[PDB]
Design a protein around this ligand. Structure first.
Ligand SMILES: O=c1ccn([C@@H]2O[C@H](CO)[C@@H](OP(=O)(O)O)[C@H]2O)c(=O)[nH]1
Length: 124
């Protein structure tokens, strides 16, 4: 019942911090955002930039999405991000993640009017 656009913001936006605090950042955020409520979501990326800068990517470099579609865009410059990936020992409901902070380019799929990001394809 929540729009695709709204769903992108809730899963991937984190403008409150400039970067991952500690090795426990992922464990905390995946819970806070309700991502481990019914199962352990396996993979998720959080972006530490302003909403305006992330939305502007839909006007940058056009590339192909992993599924063959052509509505994906790559950011001109690198951004501060945090990758979260579930560990091998992890079993619902005791969800655990590995936290990896870095500076990379992001790739998102865009749609609508206005044309904003609706999916997170990958980081480069
Ligand atoms: O680098 C990646 C790859 C996938 N995902 C996540 O994994 C899902 C696909 O399996 C993506 O769905 P969504 O685009 O609809 O949000 C995204 O949430 C990330 O967060 N980062």
């Amino acid at each position: 019942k929540e729009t695709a656009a709204a769903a992108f913001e809730a899963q991937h936006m984190d403008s409150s911090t400039s970067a991952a605090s500690s090795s426990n950042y992922c464990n905390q955020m995946m819970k806070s955002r309700n991502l481990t409520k019914d199962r352990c979501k396996p993979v998720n990326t959080f972006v530490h930039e302003s909403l305006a800068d992330v939305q502007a990517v839909c006007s940058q470099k056009n590339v192909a999405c992993a599924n063959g579609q052509t509505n994906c865009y790559q950011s001109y410059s690198t951004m501060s991000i945090t990758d979260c990936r579930e560990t091998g020992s992890s079993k619902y409901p005791n969800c655990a993640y590995k936290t990896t902070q870095a500076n990379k380019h992001i790739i998102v799929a865009c749609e609508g009017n206005p044309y904003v990001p609706v999916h997170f394809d990958a980081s480069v």
